[PDB]
Amino acid sequence: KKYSIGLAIGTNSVGWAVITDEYKVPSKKFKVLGNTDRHSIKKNLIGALLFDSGETAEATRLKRTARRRYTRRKNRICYLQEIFSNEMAKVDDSFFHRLEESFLVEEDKKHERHPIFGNIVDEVAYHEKYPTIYHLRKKLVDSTDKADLRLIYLALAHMIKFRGHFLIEGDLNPDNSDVDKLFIQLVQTYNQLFEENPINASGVDAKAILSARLSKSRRLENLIAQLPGEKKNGLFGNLIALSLGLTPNFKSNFDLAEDAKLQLSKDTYDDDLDNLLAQIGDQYADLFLAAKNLSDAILLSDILRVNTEITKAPLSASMIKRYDEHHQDLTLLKALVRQQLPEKYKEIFFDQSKNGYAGYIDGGASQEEFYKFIKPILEKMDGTEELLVKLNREDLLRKQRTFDNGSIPHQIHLGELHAILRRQEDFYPFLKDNREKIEKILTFRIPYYVGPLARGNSRFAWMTRKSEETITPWNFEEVVDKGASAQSFIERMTNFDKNLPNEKVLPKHSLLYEYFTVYNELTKVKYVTEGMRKPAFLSGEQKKAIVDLLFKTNRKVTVKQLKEDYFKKIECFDSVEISGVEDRFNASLGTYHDLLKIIKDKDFLDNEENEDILEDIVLTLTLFEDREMIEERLKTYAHLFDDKVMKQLKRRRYTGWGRLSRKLINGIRDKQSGKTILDFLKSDGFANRNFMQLIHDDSLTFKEDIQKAQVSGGDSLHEHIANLAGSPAIKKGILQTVKVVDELVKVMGRHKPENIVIEMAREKNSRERMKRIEEGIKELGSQILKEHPVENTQLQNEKLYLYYLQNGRDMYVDQELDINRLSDYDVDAIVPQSFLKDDSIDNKVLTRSDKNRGKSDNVPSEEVVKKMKNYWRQLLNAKLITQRKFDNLTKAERGGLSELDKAGFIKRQLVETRQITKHVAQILDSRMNTKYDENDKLIREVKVITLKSKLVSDFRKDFQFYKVREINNYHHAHDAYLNAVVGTALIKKYPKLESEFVYGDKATAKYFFYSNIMNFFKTEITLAEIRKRPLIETNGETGEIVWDKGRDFATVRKVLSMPQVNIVKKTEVQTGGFSKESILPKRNSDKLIARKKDWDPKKYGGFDSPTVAYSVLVVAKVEKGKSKKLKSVKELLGITIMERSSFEKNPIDFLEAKGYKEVKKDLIIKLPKYSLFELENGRKRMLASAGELQKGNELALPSKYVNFLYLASHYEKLKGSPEDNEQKQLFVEQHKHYLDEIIEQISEFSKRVILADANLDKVLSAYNKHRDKPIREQAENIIHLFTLTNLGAPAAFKYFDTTIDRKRYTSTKEVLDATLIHQSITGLYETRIDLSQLGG
RNA sequence: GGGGGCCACUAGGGACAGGAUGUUUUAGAGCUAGAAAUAGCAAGUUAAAAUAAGGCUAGUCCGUUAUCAACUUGAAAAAGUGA
DNA sequence: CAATACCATTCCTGTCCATAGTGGCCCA
DNA sequence: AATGGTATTG
Ligand SMILES: [K+]
Ligand SMILES: [K+]
Ligand SMILES: [K+]
Ligand SMILES: [K+]
Ligand SMILES: [K+]
Ligand SMILES: [K+]
Ligand SMILES: [K+]
Ligand SMILES: [K+]
Ligand SMILES: [K+]
Ligand SMILES: [K+]
Ligand SMILES: [K+]
Ligand SMILES: [K+]
Ligand SMILES: [K+]
Ligand SMILES: [Mg+2]
Ligand SMILES: [Mg+2]
């Protein structure tokens, strides 16, 4: 008894089938367990496991980190209160108690209800004097009077609890005023450097134009307008853009070739300014210098909208400006609405439901929704011009705690905190002694390279302590080993050397590593001249000379420099042919040139004595990112360099690690020669062996030493699958697949199959699209977003996305495109889809007409390339197209598509090469084949074949075994079946293909062969004339029969027509969040759940809508009526995720607390979601919850109706042949009565199983309404009708324009008397429990 | 040789440190006319506190991923059970 | 009970590691 | 996006 298994692996399904020698599907009697009269059941060996998607760890991580943040913010406030403890006790012994209980209702408050002062008079007076916290902040910053300790606490606590960002390193407020004079001085330095061409900035109000509460680019335009001449793209224009964002290429300004750009915020700024001044002269330094100067007073102008000379609290002053303008404009708006349009006053100022001022202050209306609601009301009235200006600048009636405060750096809050401490430390000594402690509370962050401050109970932590004691912000440097922690941060994530698994890899930018890469590339270079008989390698002396002359004087070495600067200069060759490198060397000594610029001592770099030193420096610069730790670690070399060089040196940093270790590169030595790997790369006689040859050559000891160093370590199956690189979604399917194969082998008497054939399906976002387009267009300098505004959702249209990615132009022709005629344009595949089935934006292009591409059987013609290469390069530099898209677009200037390329593409269409599928194949193969032969080589009893979906897809379409995904879930199982059939047949016919399709170890010819690989199934083949194949197809050598075109197609038809298919929805305990996150207001309802143990929801609000982890069958008694008489019940109790641990720790106590008595402990049945019940007439239901059910039956629609629906709907495309198109159309029209028959099948199924009477009647009327519609559209909507019958949760669907809402099953009472069906993973093994036999 | 190193991209996974909103209860004396219903008017921008209930291992830690038919012997990990 | 309509905390900055898809040089 | 919780209407 031999058999094969077909598998179809998806993100929500694993289809499986078992086939025999004749491509038939067996059927067995399987024993049925339980307490029903049914002892067995006939099962076909085909089906599909269904499951909800596996989820990533992301959401869990975001929640975990936000938790840690709330905990540490609370601890910040706690530190502050601990500082204030005793002196506050002297002033007001219950202030902090009032703060802590501020949330409680007056009934529950232990102290007086007014938090700050504990009496209504003083509290009301406080709020009158200080309407916002920023009033109190500014007063405490500016005033000199002794202030009440409680108000001091309130100001400092507000600064510490909402402390601003940390994106800016260093200290702040160097220049806060005289921006007018700074701008005059920048204009002055420009005029000094260009005495012939000066700029007159007299009268230019640079303050108002540049500190304008508007975008930077707009201010640039205005300022350039004020200066006569001086176009925005001139030198001074880009220098104004310097304080603004882009500061684009000065190459236009200085006529230099390479691209320039600067950004005073980037830490590469000093190096880029050096790189530029080396190209143009240090005399321009004062030009950027002054620029930087003028920037300092203006960089914060967006945040500090008030002069910095009347207050030392410009931020809080700006908030008070917000408040005062809010008040003035509110008075004015109220008066206007009273006068002009008095009927709307109530809707604006009283209606929270509307988006007026009421809904904006008291309702749920946002600033944007309010601006939208009030725009027309302001335009409709008079005297609202200034208010409309403030509205379109987003500065009308602003609150102070707003979504856009995220740009406030922590240094500003710190400045105000320090100012207050300085004012009041004169009166309170404890503020003087704790000034720096409080400042530290504000300024302290745990470094990202330290992680959680755990003590052995966090699986996420790596930090090591210098001593065992509580870490505070003030003793962090002493208790936490920052260096060891920062090291472990990297070393717990980096790979070891695979060849020497106990050796760490080198920094990618190590000098040694780059010597290795350069010599490895260089040793395989060959050259030919005239007198030479044969191309020669480079000798060791030649490689040393090329490294010293070229690689050590140029960052990048081109083949041209090799030919002219070495072979002509040293070898006196006029002509030489180079192989092994094209255009320019890929490897390069970048770090060598970095350190040469920094230290300016070529002899120091070239001295081998300093090798180790340099290796450490780069190591440090790689291992650490914090400037102080880098500095401390380089301190040991402070004696070798000048302080200027030490500063420049600690400035420069590297990221990334190599893949080889130092011991591999320049450590282990060959026994005979005594040479390291690098020594052979530098010189290897006449062989010039490279790295691979070196570690594989049996005449050397490197291979032996690597073998010896290797250690094997073992993961479990689940651990192994978890550690694969793939989506957790597909990993869930992989593990399910292995469990399914295990059960299937158990079903077949523990006999292993002959073949296993596996196919694997191919595998918010609009925000990424909008980001791409914004960046690319502002990098392009285009005004397309100015002239055509767009929202992210709109970019989900392919053509509009392409339009914006193409700067609104045609990509094959130099002309504009029209947004409104997008429907008339074309979307063309760069490399045609007949070769590369790629439908992504990386291979698609928007053009006015695909006809202009040229011939349709290749990449675009050379004319197009010549015309459009520069435009495409612009788009590439804007990151609007990728390098792959650009290269494919330009392939015609590189010979176009060759015949080898087309052969390869067609092979790719058939031979799977994704790593993840290969891992699935390896897993199955290592589980199935476990014995070794006499030569100790693996015995492959089971052949694991992998196929791509296109094989079986083309099969289905060519032999009319059509699939319709919406009818039911049987297509996953059928895919599995057809995979088994096609794979086994394919390798039976052509055994030599095993190398390609089985796991384990003339271009026209392969093109033809792989295009016609599947023709042995067809009876006649039309290929560019008509050829004919026999009725029986056999193997050429063995003579064995592989395919009987008569009987075997009938076998396949019979298998696809079988109604009994084992579809199983995997039952799962629900996990995750306890409930919806919405904190709801107070309500008289027991559905509300307290947010804290003592916060009664009827007084405080809270949560509702909790998630049931799993239901539980309870057979017990419950008290009834005022008498409390015991009454026997049987019902489903939903155990929520939050209740689950309590219920499981002791089920009886939990249930008795819920109200039940005398619980029959042994009749408690755990019922996860999707638990299956059968009732009468085969009607099935699945548990959706403790109080709702899902549809549980599959509609086994016959194959003739399935194929009719496919053909009539024009599912996919029917264009194979004109005459075959005609035959399909004729069959559709001849069998048009199949529409009524299909409606009848749906109706019978619904009346037996679905039981949505009203919905079925509405659907029947809708079908009888559109009987005159074309057959195509009626079929297309009949497809939609199956949403009524599909398995799972009920859903709404549409028949033409009629909408059918979901009919829900909002009661679980009936399943309590039905038959509960427990199913194994395949559903072949069942345990059926009659629940009606359970009762009181 | 579907292994390896390098170059150029692109896409996804994982961890950590931080920012701003939002929400919820309370505080921010509402006034006047009327028995009330209600009407007319005034006012509004701020804060505290919580932000999974909570847990013990008590850390400036942990609490939403992965994994799960039933039954048996099992404390549990497990292993076994049916053409 | 049964049907029906509404509801669902959001967005952002920075540091770092690995894998794997495409094209290319050199090899096992 | 879905689909299970919830209140409202009977
Ligand atoms: K009280
Ligand atoms: K001008
Ligand atoms: K609001
Ligand atoms: K190259
Ligand atoms: K680094
Ligand atoms: K020195
Ligand atoms: K889920
Ligand atoms: K789960
Ligand atoms: K109030
Ligand atoms: K199951
Ligand atoms: K929000
Ligand atoms: K992030
Ligand atoms: K590659
Ligand atoms: Mg907490
Ligand atoms: Mg808040």
Taken in order A260, A262, A268, A272, the sign of the CA dihedral is positive
Angle at A1049 between CA A1043 and CA A1053, to 5 degrees: 150
Answer for A321: CB within 7 Å of strand B. no
Q: Which of residues 1045-1104 of A touch strand D (CB under 7 A)?
A: 1083, 1085, 1087, 1104
DSSP states of A306-353: S-TTS-S-HHHHHHHHHHHHHHHHHHHHHHHHHHT-GGGHHHHHT-TT
Distance CA A1275, CA A1265 (A): 14
Q: Which residues pair with A1089 in a beta bridge?
A: A1103
> Which residue is nearest to the C1' sugar atom of B19, using CA?
A165
Separation of A628 CA from ligand 5 center, angstroms? 13
Residues 6+ apart with CB under 8 A from A4: A18, A19, A753, A754, A755, A756, A757, A980, A983, A984
**What tokens appear for A102 in the block?**
């501020």
Q: Which of residues 1246-1305 of A touch strand D (CB under 7 A)?
A: 1288-1289, 1291-1292, 1302
Separation of A586 CA from ligand 4 center, angstroms? 5
Angle in degrees, 0-180, between the axes of helices A627-634 and A611-623, rounded to the nearest 10: 160
Residues 6+ apart with CB under 8 A from A1226: none
Resolution (Å) of this entry: 2.7
**What tokens appear for A336 in the block?**
């206007």
DSSP letter assigned to residue A1248: I
Angle in degrees, 0-180, between the axes of helices A1234-1245 and A1253-1265, rounded to the nearest 10: 170
Distance CA A563, CA A575 (A): 8
For residue A1119, give the H/E element and its range.
Answer: strand A1108-1120
The answer to whether the beta carbons of residues A152 and A421 sit under 8 Å apart is no
Distance CA A668, CA A672 (A): 12
Residues 6+ apart with CB under 8 A from A241: A216, A220, A232, A247, A248
- Pick out the nucleotide with least CA–C1' distance to A448: B17
What is the CA A730 to C1' C12 distance in angstroms?
A: 30
> Which residue is nearest to the C1' sugar atom of D7, using CA?
A1085
Distance CA A1318, CA A1315 (A): 10
Separation of A1305 CA from ligand 10 center, angstroms? 22
Q: Rounded to a whole number, what is the distance in angstroms from the first to the last CA of chain A?
A: 51
Nearest 10 degrees: Cα torsion A1225, A1231, A1235, A1237: -160
Q: Which of residues 936-955 of A touch strand B (CB under 7 A)?
A: none
DSSP states of A417-484: HHHHHHHHTTT-HHHHHTHHHHHHHHH----TTT----SS--TT----BSSSS---TTSHHHHB-HHH
Q: Which of residues 933-952 of A touch strand C (CB under 7 A)?
A: none
Taken in order A1071, A1076, A1079, A1081, the sign of the CA dihedral is negative
Instruction: Return the SS3 of A357.
Output: helix
Side-chain-facing half-sphere of A116: CA atoms under 13 Å? 19
Which residue type, as a one-letter code, is found at position A849? Answer: S
Nearest to A364 by CA among A1076, A1074, A1083, A1079: A1079
Distance CA A84, CA A151 (A): 12
Answer for A455: CB within 7 Å of strand B. yes
CB atoms within 10 A of CB A981: 25
Rg (CA), chain A: 38
Q: Write down the experimental method used for this entry.
A: X-ray
Closest ligand to Cα A71 = 14
Distance CA A6, CA A955 (A): 15
Answer for A493: CB within 7 Å of strand C. yes
Distance CA A1135, CA A718 (A): 28
Distance CA A673, CA A886 (A): 48
Residues 6+ apart with CB under 8 A from A1227: A1204, A1207
Breaks (C-N over 2.5 A) in chain A follow: 713, 763, 1001, 1024
**What tokens appear for A1272 in the block?**
């195509």
What is the CA A684 to C1' B11 distance in angstroms?
A: 40
Separation of A643 CA from ligand 6 center, angstroms? 6
In strand C, the nucleotides that come within 7 Å of a protein beta carbon are 1-5, 7-28
Nearest to A81 by CA among A67, A70, A69, A92: A92
Distance CA A1323, CA A1057 (A): 19
Side-chain-facing half-sphere of A500: CA atoms under 13 Å? 17
Instruction: Return the SS3 of A60.
Output: helix
What is the CA A585 to C1' C24 distance in angstroms?
A: 12
CB atoms within 10 A of CB A56: 11
Which residue type, as a one-letter code, is found at position A504? Answer: K
- Give the domain ranges of chain A: 58-167+409-488, 214-248+256-296, 314-404, 497-709, 770-893, 1190-1313
- Pick out the nucleotide with least CA–C1' distance to A80: B60
Separation of A778 CA from ligand 13 center, angstroms? 33
Which residue type, as a one-letter code, is found at position A1192? Answer: G
Distance CA A112, CA A285 (A): 65
**What tokens appear for A203 in the block?**
């009268």
Answer for A884: CB within 7 Å of strand C. yes
Distance CA A1264, CA A1295 (A): 11
Which residue type, as a one-letter code, is found at position A1274? Answer: Q
